[PDB]
Amino acid sequence: DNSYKMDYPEMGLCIIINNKNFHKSTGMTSRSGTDVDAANLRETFRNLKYEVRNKNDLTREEIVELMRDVSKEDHSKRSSFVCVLLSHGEEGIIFGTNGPVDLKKITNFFRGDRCRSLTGKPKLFIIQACRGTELDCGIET
Amino acid sequence: CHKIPVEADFLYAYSTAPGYYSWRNSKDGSWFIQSLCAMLKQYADKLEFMHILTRVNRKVATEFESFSFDATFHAKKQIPCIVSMLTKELYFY
């Protein structure tokens, strides 16, 4: 009543989009260390019982096409859905290897009226990406 | 008679406040995913998701501070940003 039903047969998909290398035409550095990240995520979520699918170095189309197609799966036997994006970014934006994708476009495929087999179930989006270029210079304690 | 909003039941755990940089150590990986993985491995059986994310927020904020040979990029901080449209509590078991 107060707690999502986390006891379906499976916990759900955990999709990890791990972009490390960018078309130089975008002008963004290789994202050193992101594989450590991707490996941590895979193992952490193996223990929470997720089906981890790991994809590496996806273009903006490959991202939208992975997300459309996953949004079309039958999730009736799954408790939740997790999606982890590791990439460059600006506010509202995640980069494919070749250019930007709006976050809202990825998230929309999982709206309650578009992915009915996930209606009512927690959809998690863990986003390791910049949201701009301000710098928090912090303050002493 | 009983609809739910279609934007409901999303949780966006962003690595950083809106507007801001996100930080990644070139060797240990990003501060967020580092801290997210440590806190899930420690608390995913005890704590509700929001409280795990709050402790992630505390770990990024206190234990990490940027080291750079670039003065303009050096001694900076990070706070992640939990955005919940969740309607119930979330327990990973």
């Binding site: 550095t29 994202r31 460059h88 | 930080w23 990644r24 080291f67």
Partner: peptide, 4 residues
Amino acid sequence: DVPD
């Protein structure tokens, strides 16, 4: 440490 490097921005993202």
